[PDB]
Amino acid sequence: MKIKPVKVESIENPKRFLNSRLLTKIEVEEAIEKALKQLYINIDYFGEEYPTPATFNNIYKVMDNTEWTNGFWTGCLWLAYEYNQDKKLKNIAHKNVLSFLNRINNRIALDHHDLGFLYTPSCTAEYRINGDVKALEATIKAADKLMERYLIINCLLNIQLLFFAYEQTGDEKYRQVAVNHFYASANNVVRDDSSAFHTFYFDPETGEPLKGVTRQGYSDESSWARGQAWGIYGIPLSYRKMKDYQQIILFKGMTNYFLNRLPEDKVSYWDLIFTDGSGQPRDTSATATAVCGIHEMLKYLPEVDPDKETYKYAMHTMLRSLIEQYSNNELIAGRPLLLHGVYSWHSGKGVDEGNIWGDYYYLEALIRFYKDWELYW
Ligand SMILES: CC(=O)N[C@@H]1[C@@H](O[C@@H]2OC(C(=O)O)=C[C@H](O)[C@H]2O)[C@@H](O)[C@@H](COS(=O)(=O)O)O[C@H]1O
């Protein structure tokens, strides 16, 4: 299958990355510790429940297992567990997993577009870590739900569930759907200039507004920052399982586009059409996600790629900025790990607030840097 041609911008003023100091072991260790203190405080706050997708005045509310974001909370627990092996974390995370299995068994509030986000960082995660058979059972059931239930750039993250099911079961139909859906996404939800786009917001037969579908990005002519990041991370995750060199070129296109539209402090505004002086809020969650994506792609990028070293310094630059300028410093119940994201600009939700996926990808980025991390995805 082929990926359409896209414009790959060269990376502008690469020295803005190359002259940064790499993050040291001590720096990352301390950012991890600071995050974990907040996490342990939050465990007492949430109990066996979950954070809301985003915070309210930088304090999460507490909710049950019925959003698209619940898995990111469990993912934080597993990530922390990767770091200090505290059985308390795994005890609570496993409770979450049991809740996820109940949720899939009863089809409570399930939308196919979110099955990967829900089940990967929670259930697949535990399976990777200790082989738990209930975590595996929950995962495969989610995968099966996604299969029958089977276009947005987000899906690049969601199909990883399907690659996992293929590996676990040897059933090629999981992989055929994953592969087809990758190419459908790349060719229809990425513009020829490498910017992420949106698929139909309206019924293609009647023009009726689609229920539950939110406007992504400032406008039809702009570039939603988190959408761009879903591509930057989703591509290399998919490349692991596909080995199509075109995917690397597409990653370069989408990544360079992102990097070229970063502001002074290298942390993306919520939409890439905005930079310093706009007065628009940042979306740190987009930046944390891009860091994980670049880190992943760098495992596979050839040593002879003239931009490989720039990408390394770029991700260190962005992560440093998140740690130094955007990470939470007030250790009180309900505070996020990372400040200044935006959930849904157009609906006024989670604008300049912490969000749970932002917290998850920030912690994942730290763990990625600190240890040879075996992917949940
Ligand atoms: C809630 C749900 O199942 N789907 C909608 C949400 O869409 C999710 O958002 C994102 C994202 O990166 O922003 C990634 C997931 O893949 C995607 O399903 C979201 O748009 C919310 C926003 O709520 S709002 O505040 O009312 O705008 O809406 C959901 O319907």
**Structural domains in the chain, sorted by start:** 1-377 (1.50.10.10)
Closest CA to 160 of 212, 119, 201: 119
The structure was resolved experimentally with X-ray
* DSSP one-letter string for 271-330: BTT--TTS-PPB-HHHHHHHHHHHHHHHTTS-TT-TTHHHHHHHHHHHHHHIIIIIB---
Q: Are 310 and 14 in contact (CB under 8 A)?
A: yes
Are 56 and 353 in contact by the 8 Å Cβ rule? The answer is: yes
Instruction: From the CA of 111, give the closest atom in ligand 1.
Output: 3
Q: Measure 212 CA to ligand 1 centroid, in angstroms.
A: 7
Please give all residues whose beta carbon lies within 6 A of any atom in ligand 1, as ranges. 68, 111, 113-114, 117, 154, 212, 214, 226, 343-344, 347, 349
Residue minimizing CA distance to atom 14 of ligand 1: 154
Helix extents (H) in 22-121? 25-46, 70-84, 87-105, 115-119
Q: Which amino acid is at 185?
A: S
Q: Which residue has the tokens 């507004």?
A: 209
138 residue type, one letter: A
Give the ligand 1 atom nearest the CA of 348: 25
Indicate the residue type of 291. V
Contacts with 13 (C-beta within 8 Å, 6 or more apart), sequence order:
none
Contact indicator for 233, 293 with CB cutoff of 8 Å: yes
In whole angstroms, give the CA distance from residue 326 to residue 220: 29
Amino acid at 74: T
Question: Tokens for 121?
Answer: 């960082």
Find the 214 Cα to ligand 1 centroid distance in Å: 6
Query: Minimal CA–CA distance to 293: which of 327, 268, 271, 326?
Result: 268
Give the span between the Cα atoms of 117 and 78, in whole angstroms.
14
Reported as type and span, the H/E element at residue 51 is: strand 50-51
Q: Whose CA is nearest to atom 20 of ligand 1?
A: 214
Distance CA(236)–CA(250), nearest Å, equals 10
Q: Choose one of 72, 161, 344, 352 to mutate for the ligand 1 pocket test, by most ligand atoms within 8 angstroms of C-beta.
A: 344
- The residue whose C-alpha atom lies closest to atom 29 belonging to ligand 1 is 212
Residue with tokens 């304090």: 59
Distance 73 CA to ligand 1 centre (A): 16
How far is the centre of ligand 1, averaged over its atoms, from the C-alpha of 246 (Å)?
29
First and final CA of the chain: distance in angstroms? 23
How far apart CA 193 and CA 254 sit, in angstroms, is 8
Tokens of 256: 């360079």
Inter-residue contact 85 to 361 (CB < 8 Å):
no
For residue 211, what are the contacts with CB-CB under 8 A and spacing of at least 6?
A: none
344 forms beta bridges with: 349
Residue 60 CB neighbour total at 10 angstroms: 25
> 349: burial class by Cβ within 10 Å (0-12, 13-18, 19+)?
middle
Alpha helices (runs of H) in 106-224, residue ranges in sequence order = 115-119, 125-130, 133-149, 155-158, 160-169, 172-189
To test the pocket of ligand 1, the residue of 158, 214, 218 to mutate (highest count of ligand atoms within 8 Å of its CB) is: 214
How big is the CA angle at 156 (ends 356 and 225), to the nearest 5 degrees?
A: 55
CA dist., res. 215 & res. 219, Å (int): 8
229-268: b or e for each residue (b if 16 or more CB lie within 10 Å)? bbbbbbbbbbbbbbebebbbbbbbbbbbbbbebbeebbbb
How many other C-beta atoms are found inside a 10 Å radius of the C-beta of residue 17? 21
Q: How far is CA 37 from the centre of its chain?
A: 22
Report angle CA 210, 216, 222 to the nearest 5 degrees.
Answer: 130
CA distance 84 to 371: 12
Asked whether 271 and 257 are in contact (CB, 8 A), the reply is no
CA distance 159 to 113: 9
Query: Between β-strands 62-63 and 50-51, what pairing exists: parallel, antiparallel or unpaired?
Result: antiparallel
Closest-lying ligand 1 atom to the alpha carbon of residue 346: 27
Q: Positive or negative CA dihedral for 151, 154, 156, 160?
A: negative
Residues 374, 129: Cα–Cα separation, whole Å: 9
